[PDB]
Amino acid sequence: MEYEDLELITIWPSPTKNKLCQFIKQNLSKEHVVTQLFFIDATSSFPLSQFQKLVPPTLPENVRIYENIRINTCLDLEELSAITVKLLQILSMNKINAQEPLKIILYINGLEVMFRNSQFKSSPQRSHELLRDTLLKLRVMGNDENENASIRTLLEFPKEQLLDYYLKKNRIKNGDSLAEYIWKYYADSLFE
Amino acid sequence: MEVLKNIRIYPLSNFITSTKNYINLPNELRNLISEEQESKLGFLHIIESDFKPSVALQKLVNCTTGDEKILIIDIVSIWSQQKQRQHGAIYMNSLSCINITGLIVFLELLYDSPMDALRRCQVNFNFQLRGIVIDNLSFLNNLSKFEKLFKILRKLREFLGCWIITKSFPTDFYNGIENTLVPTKLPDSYMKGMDLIIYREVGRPQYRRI
């Protein structure tokens, strides 16, 4: 997938480490734009060894790439909300200080974990409301017409959390999983 | 005589002239309301499970001719996507209008000073505002705020003459992730305000009235 073809929020089920590396590589090497990756994860599971094999930091054409990848470990929806605030700050400042194009890829893995933790610390109502507010915010952010700075959001989920998707092709459950809920009510598309 | 003074004789024009716009149902939604009723439709609510607008809903909105425009309050960031924008529409897609508080503030300004409000949507005012669409009400929030929302939309219709179409998700949405929140969950005040409530259920898509 190329940045200019990304939807506001895209679900990516169970990407291989090599395909994720390839995605990062081809998108952050694009010329005449400044592309950044914010990798937000509940586990610190960025595939660093594989990334260094496929994108060696000793090759000059890759230095730029390592400069523009940002790592965060995010344990709950409150922290994700705060990260979203920081990203909005960056974007807003970039647009203001512009009145070169900045392209941000927000990649979130483990969102179902962050949700579960949040709804142990507070009500299901509170966590649904925080999830809602964050995702709707990210969509409006990604939808901004401003050319100088943009954001696109990718959500990684294990494929077992998206059976409703695979069933549509073509079990009893106790409600939707977070991934299915987002697939139905918040994401623009799902990419194999 | 009192009888003479109170005799009222109306020109036929009165019965076919109106300061208000009415919703034109696409054939997907005909055979639900009678003729007269479908000629008097001002508030329509649709309940449907799809995140993106169904075909019926899309056809309800591109009812645009010449200078007419529809204001779409795009809480969901779908209608106003670059690749989805239409000439017959004006869009409100803003961080100040994705919660019911900001929504109500925006509509209140639209009523008070339509120019000031429409400037927020990047709009040239050589257009009649034909309708307002709000998608999706399920993301809002309770009853007092929805009563307020309905009242402001009703005032907007009274003043500007626009029709109103809103959408919500079915009950499934309100069940929440893994049912932890446990045929739509909107206040009966709001719903009682509607002229027509459509429900789209789906192998195939049927549209029933409620």
Curated annotation (Swiss-Prot), chain A:
Its keywords, alphabetically, are: Cytoplasm, DNA damage, DNA repair, Meiosis, Nucleus
Q: Which GO terms describe its cellular component?
A: cytoplasm; nucleus; Shu complex; site of double-strand break
Q: Which GO terms describe its biological process?
A: DNA recombinase assembly; error-free postreplication DNA repair; maintenance of rDNA; meiotic chromosome segregation; positive regulation of single-strand break repair via homologous recombination; recombinational repair
Q: Give the location in the cell.
A: Cytoplasm; Nucleus
Location, primary (coarse class): cytoplasm
Could you describe the subunit structure of this protein?
Component of the SHU complex composed of at least CSM2, PSY3, SHU1 and SHU2.
Q: State its role.
A: Involved in chromosome segregation during meiosis. Promotes efficient recombinational repair and functions in the protection of the genome from spontaneous and induced DNA damage like mutations and gross chromosomal rearrangements (GCRs).
Q: Into which family does the record put it?
A: Belongs to the CSM2 family.
Q: What is the additional note?
A: Present with 414 molecules/cell in log phase SD medium.
Its protein name is Chromosome segregation in meiosis protein 2
Source species, please?
Answer: Saccharomyces cerevisiae (strain ATCC 204508 / S288c)
UniProtKB/Swiss-Prot annotation, chain B:
The answer to whether keyword Transmembrane helix applies is no
Enumerate the UniProt keywords alphabetically: DNA damage, DNA repair, Nucleus
What subcellular locations does the record give? Answer: Nucleus
Under Gene3D superfamilies, the record lists:
P-loop containing nucleotide triphosphate hydrolases
Q: Which InterPro entries match?
A: P-loop_NTPase (IPR027417), Psy3 (IPR031779)
Q: How does it assemble?
A: Component of the SHU complex composed of at least CSM2, PSY3, SHU1 and SHU2.
Per the entry, what this protein does is:
Required for resistance to the DNA-damaging agents methyl methanesulfonate (MMS), cisplatin and oxaliplatin, but not to mitomycin C. Plays a role in protection against mutation accumulation. May be a component of the recombination-repair pathway.
Protein name per the record: Platinum sensitivity protein 3
Q: What is the lineage of its organism?
A: Eukaryota, Fungi, Dikarya, Ascomycota, Saccharomycotina
